[PDB]
C-alpha cells in the first residue's frame, strides 16, 4: 500500500502549510515612513512666515486663499502648508524659539528681509523633497500592522479581524463545508479557500475507517476525527495545528511571503487536468487513504497557474507581499528624504550668520 496515503506521507507539505498558518493573529512591525522631514520642513515654513511682512502675515489672521489668488495653482497648493505654519506660530513662545534657533532674535529689519530672501532657493530645493516624502506617506498609509493582520487572518482562517481568529468551518470553507469531502477539498464551486481549509483537506482523519490519520505527521494526536464529510472538522484541526510551532521572521518581509507562495507553487502537481496539493491516488480528495488526502485545484494547469494566485488565501498573502514590497523601498527612501530635510532646516538656521558677517 505504498501508493495509499500513509502516516507521514504529507509531512513535507504540512511543514510548508504550518509556516503559512503561523501568519494568523500576527503581531509584526512594518517598515515605517520616516516623517521627521515633514516637521523639519514645517519649521522652515514657520521661519519663513516669521520673517515675512505684516501684509503677508495678515492673510492668515483662512480655509482658502484671498480674493485674487483663489485660482492661483501655487497658492492653492501652499495654502494648507502656510495655514499650518501660521497656526503653529500662534503658540506661546513658538516664534521666539524659531527666531532664536535661526540666530535672528532681535534682528534688524534689513537682516530679517535679507534672511527671508536667502531662504528662497533653500525652500525651493526642500519643497521637492518634502512633497515626495508626503506622497510616500500617503501611498503607504494603508500598510499597517492591523491591516496586514486582518488580511493574513482572512488568508488563514477566513476571518477579517486583527486578532482572535480561530478555526471555524463556516469561515475556513467558502460557504461552510460541502455535501462531501471531495467537493469541500476543491479550490480554483470553490471551497477550500483558506490555509486552514487546506490543512483540513491535506491532514484530516475522516470518520468511518479507511482514513489516513497522521498523514501530516506521526506526532499529531488525533483524539477524534473530522466526522463524515468534514462535518466536525474543527476538533480534528485543533489536534493537527497543535503540532505546528512555526514563526515567521520579524518584521515580516515581502521576500519571506513570496518564498512561501513560491514553495507551494513548486509542490502542486498536475494530473488529468487538475492540480493537487497533498497525496492523491484515485477518484478525489475524499480523505480515504486509497483515494487522496489533498486539495484538488480543479482545472488548474501549468498554463492557467495565474488562477492559483486568485484563490482567496493566495490573493490575500500576495496583496500583503505587494504592499510590503512597496513600503520596504519607500521606508528606506524616507530615511534619506528626512535627513535631507533636517539638513535644510539646519542650513536655514545658518543664513543669518552669513548675512551678518557679509554686512560687516
Ligand atoms: C515664504 O514667505 C513669502 C512671504 O514672505 C512667500 O512669498 C509669496 O509667495 C507667493 C507664492 O509664490 C507669491 O505669489 C505670487 O504673487 C504674485 C503677485 O504678488 C503680489 O501680491 C502678493 C500678495 O498680495 C504680494 O505678496 C506680492 O508682494 C505682490 O504684491 C503673482 O503674480 C504670482 O503669480 C505667478 O506665479 C505663480 C507661482 O508662484 C503662478 O501660479 C501664477 O500663475 C503666476 O504665474 C504666471 O504669471 C506670471 C506673471 O505674468 C508669469 O511670469 C508666469 O510665467 C505665469 O505665467 C504669485 O501668485 C507672493 O508674491 C510671495 N510674496 C512675497 C511678499 O514674496 C513664500 O511663498 C514663502 N515660501 C514658501 C516656500 O512657502
Automatic annotation (TrEMBL):
The top of its lineage is: Eukaryota, Discoba, Euglenozoa, Kinetoplastea, Metakinetoplastina
Q: Does the keyword Signal apply?
A: yes
Which residue positions carry a glycan here? 288, 290
Q: Where is this region: Disordered?
A: 62-74
Compartments, record wording: Cell membrane
The residues covered by the Trypanosome variant surface glycoprotein B-type N-terminal domain are 1-341
Function of this protein? Answer: VSG forms a coat on the surface of the parasite. The trypanosome evades the immune response of the host by expressing a series of antigenically distinct VSGs from an estimated 1000 VSG genes.
Q: Which residues of the full protein are shown?
A: 20 to 389 of 509
> What are the record keywords, sorted?
Cell membrane, Glycoprotein, GPI-anchor, Lipoprotein, Membrane, Signal
Q: Which domain of life is it from?
A: Eukaryota
Determine if Membrane is one of this entry's keywords: yes
Q: Which organism is it from?
A: Trypanosoma brucei brucei
Disulfide bond sites: 18-244, 185-201, 203-216, 285-294
Q: How does it sit in the membrane?
A: Lipid-anchor; GPI-anchor
Spell out the GO cellular component terms annotated for this protein, sorted alphabetically and separated by semicolons.
Answer: plasma membrane; side of membrane
Protein known as: Variant surface glycoprotein
Amino acid at each position: 500500500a505504498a501508493d495509499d496515503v500513509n502516516p507521514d506521507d504529507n509531512k513535507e507539505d504540512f511543514a510548508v502549510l504550518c509556516a503559512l498558518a503561523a501568519l494568523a493573529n500576527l503581531q509584526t512591525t512594518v517598515p515605517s515612513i520616516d516623517t521627521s522631514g515633514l516637521a523639519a520642513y514645517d519649521n522652515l515654513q514657520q521661519l519663513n512666515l516669521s520673517l515675512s511682512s505684516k501684509e503677508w502675515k495678515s492673510l492668515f489672521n483662512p480655509k482658502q486663499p484671498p480674493e485674487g489668488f483663489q485660482s492661483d495653482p501655487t497658492w492653492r497648493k501652499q495654502w494648507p502648508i502656510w495655514v499650518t505654519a501660521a497656526a503653529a506660530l500662534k503658540a506661546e513662545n513658538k516664534e521666539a524659539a524659531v527666531l532664536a534657533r535661526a540666530g535672528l532674535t532681535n534682528a534688524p529689519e534689513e537682516l530679517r528681509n535679507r534672511a527671508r530672501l536667502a531662504l528662497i532657493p533653500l525652500l525651493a530645493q526642500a519643497e521637492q523633497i518634502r512633497d515626495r516624502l508626503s506622497e510616500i506617506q500617503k501611498q503607504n498609509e494603508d500598510t499597517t500592522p492591523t491591516a496586514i493582520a486582518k488580511a493574513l487572518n482572512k488568508a488563514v482562517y477566513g476571518q477579517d479581524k486583527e486578532t482572535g481568529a480561530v478555526y471555524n468551518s463556516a469561515d475556513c470553507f467558502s460557504g461552510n463545508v460541502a455535501d462531501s469531502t471531495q467537493n469541500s477539498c476543491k479550490a480554483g464551486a470553490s471551497k477550500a479557500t483558506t490555509v486552514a481549509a487546506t490543512i483540513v483537506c491535506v491532514c484530516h482523519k475522516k470518520n468511518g475507517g479507511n482514513d489516513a490519520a497522521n498523514a501530516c505527521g506521526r506526532l499529531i494526536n488525533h483524539q477524534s476525527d473530522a466526522g463524515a464529510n468534514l462535518a466536525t472538522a474543527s476538533s480534528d484541526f485543533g489536534d493537527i495545528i497543535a503540532t505546528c510551532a512555526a514563526r515567521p521572521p520579524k518584521p515580516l518581509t515581502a521576500a519571506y511571503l513570496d518564498s512561501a507562495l513560491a514553495a507551494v507553487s513548486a509542490r502542486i502537481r498536475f494530473k488529468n487536468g487538475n492540480g493537487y496539493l497533498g497525496k492523491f491516488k484515485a477518484t478525489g480528495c475524499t480523505g480515504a487513504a486509497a483515494e487522496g488526502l489533498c486539495v484538488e485545484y480543479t482545472a488548474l494547469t501549468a498554463a492557467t497557474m495565474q488562477n492559483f494566485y486568485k484563490i482567496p488565501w493566495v490573493k490575500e498573502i500576495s496583496n500583503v507581499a505587494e504592499a510590503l514590497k512597496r513600503t520596504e523601498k519607500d521606508a528606506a527612501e524616507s530615511t534619506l528624504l528626512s535627513t535631507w530635510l533636517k539638513a535644510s532646516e539646519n542650513q536655514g538656521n545658518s543664513v543669518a550668520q552669513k548675512l551678518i558677517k557679509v554686512g560687516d
